[PDB]
Design a protein around this ligand. Structure first.
Ligand SMILES: OCCNc1ncnc2oc(-c3ccccc3)c(-c3ccccc3)c12
Length: 260
């Protein structure tokens, strides 16, 4: 499957990445609409992540889930690398949050269900995601959440989404992902992450202490689920099935909890 740039018509820019642009594109022979991520080789070398990318792309290609952004292939020229991605027409959960300001409990519950399913599935493949941010959550045509970044591992930057074990320089595992769900569940409902601060060093301290509080409009069931997930000790974090079978979740979600 040796693709080349001449195989595609390039359309509008879908957005910027630090390492490269993403463009709507269409494969000429088939007319298949997709996304093309363009990464500059110099930068990948310079930042010494080029091998990070490689690892992640290899993990990514092995993932088949409706809640995980599909990677169709890759190719490169002298100057750049290119990832051929599934096109997610409805944008990022990040933009949706900016426009809506905050989500209702049924949209939140549905997104947490879909994230949890995606992660159950990854955990079942001995795959663990690094931090998960709204910027890296894309939406398909029916508005289904898709995890779009390849930040996985079998074994910064803003700190807002990182767990204490990962900032405190400790040992991290699948429970990292459980923390992620808690940060996102709070953020969806409130409109900002629970440990947000005006400085790295601030945010560091809030996370390490697990120092946050709820606005009055957050309900008891949401509160209960978030407090159970935002646990300094990873082993006290619930398992993904317990998230899927949480009364707040089953009561509010539109999707069922595929474990299976
Ligand atoms: O690895 C993910 C690359 N990015 C994408 N990949 C695959 N599909 C996509 O659709 C988007 C997108 C969709 C509609 C509106 C705007 C953007 C984007 C997009 C790219 C960069 C930053 C923000 C969002 C995108």
């Amino acid at each position: 499957r040796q693709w080349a740039l001449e195989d595609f018509e390039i359309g509008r820019p879908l957005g910027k990445g630090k390492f490269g642009n993403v463009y709507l594109a269409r494969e000429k022979q088939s007319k298949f609409i997709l996304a093309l991520k363009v990464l500059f080789k110099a930068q990948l070398e310079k930042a010494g992540v080029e091998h990070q990318l490689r690892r992640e792309v290899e993990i990514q290609s092995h993932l088949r889930h409706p809640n995980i952004l599909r990677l169709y292939g890759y190719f490169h020229d002298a100057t750049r690398v290119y990832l051929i991605l599934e096109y997610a027409p409805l944008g990022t959960v990040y933009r949706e949050l900016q426009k809506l300001s905050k989500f209702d409990e049924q949209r939140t519950a549905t997104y947490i269900t879909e994230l949890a399913n995606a992660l159950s599935y990854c955990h079942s493949k001995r795959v663990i995601h690094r931090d998960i941010k709204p910027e890296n959550l894309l939406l398909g045509s029916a508005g289904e959440l898709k995890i779009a970044d390849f930040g996985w591992s079998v074994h910064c930057g803003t700190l807002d989404y990182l767990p204490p074990e990962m900032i405190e320089g400790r040992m991290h595992d699948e429970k990292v992902d459980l923390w992620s769900l808690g940060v996102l569940c709070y953020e969806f409902l409130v409109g900002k992450p629970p440990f947000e601060a005006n400085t790295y060093q601030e945010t560091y301290k809030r996370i390490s202490r697990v120092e946050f509080t709820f606005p009055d409009f957050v309900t008891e069931g949401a509160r209960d689920l978030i407090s159970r997930l935002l646990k300094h000790n990873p082993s006290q974090r619930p398992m993904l099935r317990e998230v899927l079978e949480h009364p707040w979740i089953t009561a509010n979600s539109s999707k069922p909890s595929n474990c299976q």
